[PDB]
């Protein structure tokens, strides 16, 4: 009962947790371009309003949201310090020596960079911590179907993704089994120097590969026995239901879109 879905996910009831994955996916895709368009202060103000409204409507702890920030920090500093060190001049310089310049341009532009970075990270982490991992594959399959006209097999890709998103846990478990069964023979996993670290991993790659291939062959035979002739000649069982919550969310986003369009600097 203590389900452990792959990766990270919160089972918290909310409104955002109830949207169709399709709408969330498309909104996430369009968010980058919408951010790109904004240039002036009022633009960023309206964008901040939209994002803060969105995140606050999810009941997620503010602590988790900062976790996704951590594996990007060095770039954040690097960028801000460089743009406050070798930067365009113009204004009241606080301290100048050699290339070092500290003007009002630094304040305004650095504030812009920081806010934009924060928004991008926020809307990136929300998508992950707003949707069941499994449904993402089905949503992508549904939103990729129109590609059939240009003759790129998509149903086969959907089948492959469905296969992989089930295999992942089993391989991760076999990895632990191999780890333990070989630590029985004294192979110190993780100790020693870097050369020793990478030298002792071959008896964690070879057996995993062999076991994976055996599983693949047996699964292929079993599936063929059922009658899986080809693709695109097959009905669908797990379907999606587009409710009006999606319509209202899309309408609100488009209202914000037109607002940013008319209020930005042309």
């Amino acid at each position: 009962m203590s389900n452990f879905i792959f990766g990270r996910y919160l089972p918290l009831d909310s409104v955002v947790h109830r949207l169709d994955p399709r709408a969330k996916l498309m909104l996430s895709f369009c968010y980058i371009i919408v951010v790109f368009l904004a240039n002036n202060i009022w633009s960023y103000a309206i964008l901040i309003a939209f994002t803060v409204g969105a995140i606050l409507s999810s009941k997620i702890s503010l602590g988790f949201f900062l976790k996704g920030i951590r594996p990007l920090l060095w770039l954040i500093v690097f960028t801000v310090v460089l743009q406050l060190l070798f930067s365009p001049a113009g204004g009241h310089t606080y301290f100048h020596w050699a290339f070092i310049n500290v003007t009002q341009d630094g304040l305004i532009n650095a504030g812009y960079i920081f806010v934009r970075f924060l928004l991008i990270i926020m809307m990136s982490t929300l998508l992950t911590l707003s949707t069941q991992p499994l449904d993402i594959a089905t949503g992508l399959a549904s939103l990729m179907k129109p590609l059939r006209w240009v003759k790129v097999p998509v149903d086969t890709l959907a089948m492959m993704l469905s296969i992989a998103l089930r295999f992942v846990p089993t391989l991760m478990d076999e990895a632990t089994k191999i780890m333990n069964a070989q630590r029985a023979r004294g192979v110190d996993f993780g100790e020693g120097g870097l050369f020793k670290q990478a030298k002792s991993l071959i008896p964690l790659m070879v057996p995993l590969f062999m076991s994976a291939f055996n599983r693949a062959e047996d699964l292929s035979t079993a599936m063929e026995a059922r009658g899986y002739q080809d693709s695109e000649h097959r009905s669908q069982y797990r379907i999606l239901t587009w409710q009006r919550r999606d319509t209202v969310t899309w309408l609100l986003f488009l209202l914000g879109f037109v607002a940013i369009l008319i209020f930005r600097h042309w």
């Binding site: 499994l134 469905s162 846990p169 699964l219 079993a222 026995a225 899986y228 009905s235 069982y237």
Partner: protein, 278 residues
């Protein structure tokens, strides 16, 4: 009854230069029966099982199921009436939920969603699996996966149930439960079931033993007549039941019991009447 499965002159090699695995397999199958193909490891019987469903391409001979003779053009038609459960119970799932697995068969054959849910629900409730419908697949008991696969194959509604080895990976209780479930299914829907086996119990319930050794029919009899070959039954591919244990043990200790096969009740009554008289 008209022989559902007709097989004759079957010789095949899954590797060109390997020793003859199967050689001129000749046997027949009626309807509503329970066969048993038992033989020591290395003789080759899984090859026979795989060939019976038209999986491996063979050359010599011809197999016929439900009138249609097997050709490399009608295999898809044949496979509709043939279903089987494979050896390892962890390498037979296709979906991310039990419901998806049991649905897979129905989805494969072009059908409508609106009609799907009642059938999958009935199938799941026909094997006592309903309460685990929504959970992930890598959480069930070892035998529960076999039960789910059985539910799916029941849902597809076939006539022949090739019960390839499906009782080695499990524990005693799971084996007993699976045997009971297949008993119930056979009794209800009149399904002919073949079985590749090493355990005594499944062979005991069957009605015909078809010992195969070195790709050859060496014997064929009724369970009763074949559970009498002393120690060599161990080499045959089975384990002697407890009755045979006591049977053989008594002989060495200087007492001669009867000859024919007996169950628990028969030996019980024989010993009780023999001793209580004196």
């Amino acid at each position: 009854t008209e022989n559902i499965i007709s097989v004759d002159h079957l010789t095949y090699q899954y590797d060109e230069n390997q020793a003859p695995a199967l050689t001129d397999v000749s046997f027949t199958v009626h309807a509503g029966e329970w066969l048993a193909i038992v033989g020591h490891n290395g003789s080759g019987k899984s090859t026979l099982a795989k060939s019976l469903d038209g999986l491996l391409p063979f050359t010599q001979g011809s197999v016929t199921v439900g009138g249609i003779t097997l050709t490399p053009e009608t295999v898809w038609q044949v496979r509709e009436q043939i279903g089987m459960i494979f050896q390892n119970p962890d390498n037979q799932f296709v979906g991310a939920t039990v419901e998806d697995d049991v649905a897979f068969g129905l989805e494969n054959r072009q059908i409508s969603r609106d009609e799907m849910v009642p059938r999958v629900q009935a199938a799941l409730a026909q094997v006592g699996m309903t309460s685990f419908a929504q959970r992930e697949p890598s959480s069930l008991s070892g035998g529960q996966k076999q039960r789910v696969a059985l539910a799916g194959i029941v849902a597809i509604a076939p006539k022949i149930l090739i019960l390839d080895e499906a009782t080695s990976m499990l524990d005693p209780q799971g084996r007993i439960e699976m045997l009971a479930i297949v008993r119930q299914l056979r009794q209800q829907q009149n399904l002919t079931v073949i079985s590749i086996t090493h355990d005594i119990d499944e062979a005991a319930s069957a009605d015909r033993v078809l010992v195969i050794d070195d790709g050859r029919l060496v014997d064929e009899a009724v369970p009763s007549q074949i559970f009498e070959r002393g120690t060599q039954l161990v080499e045959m591919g089975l384990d002697l039941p407890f009755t045979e244990k006591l049977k053989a043990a008594l002989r060495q200790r200087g007492i001669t019991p009867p000859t024919t096969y007996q169950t628990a009740a028969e030996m019980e009554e024989w010993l009780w009447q023999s001793l209580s008289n004196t």
